[PDB]
Amino acid sequence: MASGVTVSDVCKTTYEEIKKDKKHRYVIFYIRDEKQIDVETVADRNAEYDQFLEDIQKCGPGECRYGLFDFEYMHQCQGTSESSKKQKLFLMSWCPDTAKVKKKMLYSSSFDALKKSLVGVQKYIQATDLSEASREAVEEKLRATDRQ
Template sequence: MASGVTVADACKKIHEEIKRDKKHRYAIFYIKDGKQIDVELIGARNEEYEDFLTNLQAGGAGECRYGLFDFEYMHQCQGTSESSKKQKLFLISWCPDTASVKKKMVYAR
């Protein structure tokens, strides 16, 4: 097992496109060849959370993944009558119970 896992430049680019530019709704990442985190799939801006969850688990019962999701919601502050749009980025680690211990350990680092 490699001593360290690196992050591909494409991941950093997609992260900025989601966070700053709002180009995509989400991205799914995987560890390629046990050595580098890379982009597996990018979700269009009009996709929903259910699409994200489906794609996060699309690798199968034995596969782990990372997911980055841009969550948007309306929030009304106490004492005001107006709602404002808020956004939060969530980074999710998906490691199903059916994945091998080795895979879970690599994704847990």
């Protein structure tokens, strides 16, 4: 099921700046005029995950957004005493339970368009409250893909 909402070119450009150039840490997307996904906030490369959570919620408790984040965490391979830094890109659909049905429908039905436009994302995360968006929750999901 699709809404027909399109993805702006800037979204793709910003995505490449994060994935390939490592220029930015994360980006927040929003749907402009119910017609097109566009870039709302771009954070510098040194930005932390807490800032990401603040930014994605900054527009209010009923507002929906998408968030892309280049997440870094430590991974210890079984049998090796050495922890290596892993980086994985995830894309989050933020649709708080407090959001109105129209907004929820709009964002959920537009998410696939964004996914298809951003090739190479490792994990797609659905979040409706902070328990699902927390660092711990996200990290757990990302690790689940870690090749043992």
